[PDB]
């Protein structure tokens, strides 16, 4: 069967990369063997008589077809860069993407065993939307997903929709999994104003940084070290669905805040009032979040 062969090809490509990579999270040296070990687990479980969950479009089989083709494409990108500033950045972005691919596979096939049909989103309104719109499916192509989301939260076609796609699609696969929609709706809660929240915080906010690691943001914030109240906020790529707010304190040290149940807009507005989050990316413009 073709899925078994494809799983073997993927495990081999991850081993080649792992050997070609011979530090701080996300690290390809860590992620490559971890993802391979998970795929070996998936292969074993797919031998079982049941365990595939509801079939058809967007089920476990479809998820793996799309996931392993994308994992191949990203692995080719890494191989083409590795030695046998630009390079550091390209390998950082790809490490973030691998951290995303690992987290998604772990969320949906923990221990190798599919749970995409049972998976539950963090935010209840978003969970209901997914199960009502998408049913038992764990993954959709972007164009279908943009249509379904639009029954509730329509986005303007063109550059805005494409920006939304770039934000939601953590694995850069062109498909949205239930795990990606969980992360997105957690980050940009609350549900009733979901895309307004995303517009105000991730398209029109100079403090937002996507696809940057902890080390890259520290390097960025150090530049602001003489402007206390400077801050940037990014989605964590190691603790998916959480924000990490990096900020310059009064004394000039770089601290971190992690939001919990409060929407980001509330955290930033309260941190503005308290005088902590004042100059986004060190810029003078701080957007009004009411």
- Residues in Cβ contact with 3 at an 8 Å cutoff, skipping those fewer than 6 apart: 46, 61, 64, 65
Pick the closer one to Ca ion by CB: 145 or 208.
Answer: 145
Minimum distance from residue 276 beta carbon to Ca ion (Å): 34
Chain positions contacting Ca ion, by CB under 5 A: 169, 171, 173, 175
Pick the closer one to Ca ion by CB: 15 or 166.
Answer: 166
* Nearest alpha carbon to residue 175 among 146, 139, 202, 201: 139
The answer to whether the CB of 168 falls within 8 A of the CB of 176 is yes
Report CA-CA distances (Å) from 2 to 9, 43, 105, 109, 111.
11, 12, 19, 19, 21
Minimum distance from residue 282 beta carbon to Ca ion (Å): 32
Minimum distance from residue 270 beta carbon to Ca ion (Å): 33
Report CA-CA distances (Å) from 147 to 67, 70, 126, 150, 206.
22, 23, 16, 5, 29
CA atoms within a 13 Å half-sphere pointing along the CA-CB vector of 74: 28
Minimum distance from residue 173 beta carbon to Ca ion (Å): 4
171 marked among binding-site residues = yes
Minimum distance from residue 261 beta carbon to Ca ion (Å): 26
Q: Distance of alpha carbon 137 from its chain centroid, rounded?
A: 19
Minimum distance from residue 254 beta carbon to Ca ion (Å): 31
Pick the closer one to Ca ion by CB: 181 or 231.
Answer: 181
Q: Look up residue 138 and give its DSSP letter.
A: S
Strand partners, 244: 234
CA atoms within a 13 Å half-sphere pointing along the CA-CB vector of 152: 15
DSSP H or E run through 256: strand 254-257
180 marked among binding-site residues = yes
Pick the closer one to Ca ion by CB: 230 or 236.
Answer: 236
Report CA-CA distances (Å) from 116 to 53, 97, 121, 254.
8, 20, 11, 39
Pick the closer one to Ca ion by CB: 182 or 281.
Answer: 182
Pick the closer one to Ca ion by CB: 175 or 205.
Answer: 175
Minimum distance from residue 11 beta carbon to Ca ion (Å): 21
Pick the closer one to Ca ion by CB: 74 or 175.
Answer: 175
User: Within a 10 A sphere around the Cβ of 193, how many other Cβ atoms?
Assistant: 15
Residue nearest Ca ion by beta-carbon distance: 173
Q: Which residues are annotated as a binding site for 4-O-phospho-L-tyrosine?
A: 234
Binding-site annotation: residue ranges: 169, 171, 180, 234
Which amino acids are annotated as binding site for Ca(2+), given as ranges? 169, 171, 180
């Amino acid at each position: 069967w073709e899925e078994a062969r494809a799983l073997g090809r993927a495990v081999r490509m991850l081993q080649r990369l792992e050997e070609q990579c011979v530090v701080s999270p996300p690290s390809l040296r860590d992620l490559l063997p971890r993802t391979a070990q998970l795929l070996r687990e998936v292969a074993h479980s797919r031998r079982a008589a049941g365990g595939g969950g509801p079939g058809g479009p967007g089920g476990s089989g479809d998820f793996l077809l799309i996931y392993l083709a994308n994992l191949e494409a990203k692995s080719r990108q890494v191989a083409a860069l590795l030695p046998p500033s630009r390079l550091r950045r390209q390998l950082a972005k790809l490490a973030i993407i691998f951290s995303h691919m690992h987290a998604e596979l772990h969320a949906l096939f923990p221990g190798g065993k599919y749970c995409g049909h049972m998976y539950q989103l963090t935010k209840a309104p978003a969970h209901t939307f997914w199960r009502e719109s998408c049913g038992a499916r764990c993954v959709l192509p972007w164009a279908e997903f943009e249509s379904l989301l639009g029954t509730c939260h329509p986005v303007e076609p063109g550059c805005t929709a494409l920006a939304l796609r770039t934000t939601i699609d953590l694995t850069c696969s062109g498909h949205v999994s239930i795990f990606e929609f969980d992360v997105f709706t957690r980050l940009f809660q609350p549900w009733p104003t979901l895309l307004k929240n995303w517009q105000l915080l991730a398209v029109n906010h100079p403090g937002y940084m996507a696809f940057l690691t902890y080390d890259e943001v520290q390097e960025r914030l150090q530049a602001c070290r003489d402007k206390p109240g400077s801050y940037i906020f990014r989605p964590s790529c190691t603790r998916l669905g959480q924000w990490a707010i990096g900020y310059v304190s009064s004394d000039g040290s770089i601290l971190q805040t992690i939001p919990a149940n409060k929407p980001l807009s509330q955290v930033l507005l309260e941190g503005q009032k308290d005088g902590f989050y004042l100059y986004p990316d060190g810029k003078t413009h701080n957007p009004d979040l009411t």
